[PDB]
Amino acid sequence: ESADLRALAKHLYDSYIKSFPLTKAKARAILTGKTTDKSPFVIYDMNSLMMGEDKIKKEVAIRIFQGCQFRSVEAVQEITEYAKSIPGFVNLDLNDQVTLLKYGVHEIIYTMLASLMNKDGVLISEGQGFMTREFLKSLRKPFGDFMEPKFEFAVKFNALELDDSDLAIFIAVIILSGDRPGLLNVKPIEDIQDNLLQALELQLKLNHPESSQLFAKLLQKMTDLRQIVTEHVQLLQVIKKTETDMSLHPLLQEIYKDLY
Ligand SMILES: COc1ccc2c(c1)c(CC(=O)O)c(C)n2C(=O)c1ccc(Cl)cc1
Numbered sequence: 216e217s218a219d220l221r222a223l224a225k226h227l228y229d230s231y232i233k234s235f236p237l238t239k240a241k242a243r244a245i246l247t248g249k250t251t252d253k254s255p256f257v258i259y260d261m262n263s264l265m266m267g268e269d270k271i272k273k274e275v276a277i278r279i280f281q282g283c284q285f286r287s288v289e290a291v292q293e294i295t296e297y298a299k300s301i302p303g304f305v306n307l308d309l310n311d312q313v314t315l316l317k318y319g320v321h322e323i324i325y326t327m328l329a330s331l332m333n334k335d336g337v338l339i340s341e342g343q344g345f346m347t348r349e350f351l352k353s354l355r356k357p358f359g360d361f362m363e364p365k366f367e368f369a370v371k372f373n374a375l376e377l378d379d380s381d382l383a384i385f386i387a388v389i390i391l392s393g394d395r396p397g398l399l400n401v402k403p404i405e406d407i408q409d410n411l412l413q414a415l416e417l418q419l420k421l422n423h424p425e426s427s428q429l430f431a432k433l434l435q436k437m438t439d440l441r442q443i444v445t446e447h448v449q450l451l452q453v454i455k456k457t458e459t460d461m462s463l464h465p466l467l468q469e470i471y472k473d474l475y
């Protein structure tokens with residue numbers, strides 16, 4: 216079993232690397248000054264944003280809005296590709312596969328968003344750019360309040376100091392939650408999570424031997440993930456009631472209508 220769990224961990228990590236182009240490792244190298252990667256253009260005001268458009272591949276709050284959207288959709292596409300590699304996932308009832316993805320993708324998105332963040336801002340455009348926390352906070356209501364909750368989580372979450380091999384199993388654990396609403400066959404989902412949970416436990420113990428109860432502390436973080444989703448959805452509802460001229464991407468619209 217112990218050798219089997221390591222096999223499971225290595226399998227998931229390999230799938231993770233194959234599925235997510237911008238890893239935490241790449242993100243850290245960019246954010247700290249490493250020579251393996253190159254420096255981002257920093258956007259911190261209106262003119263940096265204007266010049267950033269020239270360097271990086273009508274209202275700005277709207278443009279930034281539309282930017283996250285395309286990125287979220289892309290992320291959903293990646294997380295979906297990853298889930299199919301989770302042993303057992305494709306063998307589940309198709310309705311359950313959908314349900315697991317529906318409630319799971321945003322929790323993974325915010326998890327992985329933490330990798331691209333520090334207390335000062337977030338990587339964008341596959342790491343070419345960097346948007347500051349304060350520029351985001353300064354955006355007009357309600358747009359200014361969207362990102363700050365993510366930062367506060369990311370700051371707390373990044374203190375756990377997980378690397379990608381850690382995250383690979385954790386996101387796998389998130390997808391295979393037996394307590395999602397509407398699931399038909401909970402039992403096969405829980406059997407897969409049991410093994411995934413076992414593998415996370417051993418992975419965290421071997422990769423972080425000195426940080427006690429990291430497993431427990433990491434599982435407790437799923438609480439914070441939920442509140443991020445709940446709060447976000449409510450802020451989105453304000454947008455739809457106010458900006459009747461724009462809409463969510465169909466895929467995003469399906470994920471959200473009607474989650475909770
Ligand atoms: C990756 O997490 C985010 C962050 C912001 C998001 C989204 C997702 C989505 C998509 C989603 O909810 O998955 C939309 C549609 N966002 C916005 O409109 C928005 C509003 C204000 C600002 Cl300052 C920035 C973006």
Ligand SMILES: COc1ccc2c(c1)c(CC(=O)O)c(C)n2C(=O)c1ccc(Cl)cc1
Nearest residue numbers: 268278279282283286287338339340341346
């Ligand atoms: C999910 O987290 C975020 C937050 C902000 C983002 C993005 C992602 C992306 C997508 C990405 O990160 O690749 C873009 C593109 N964001 C912009 O604010 C932006 C910058 C310049 C222009 Cl012209 C328009 C929008």
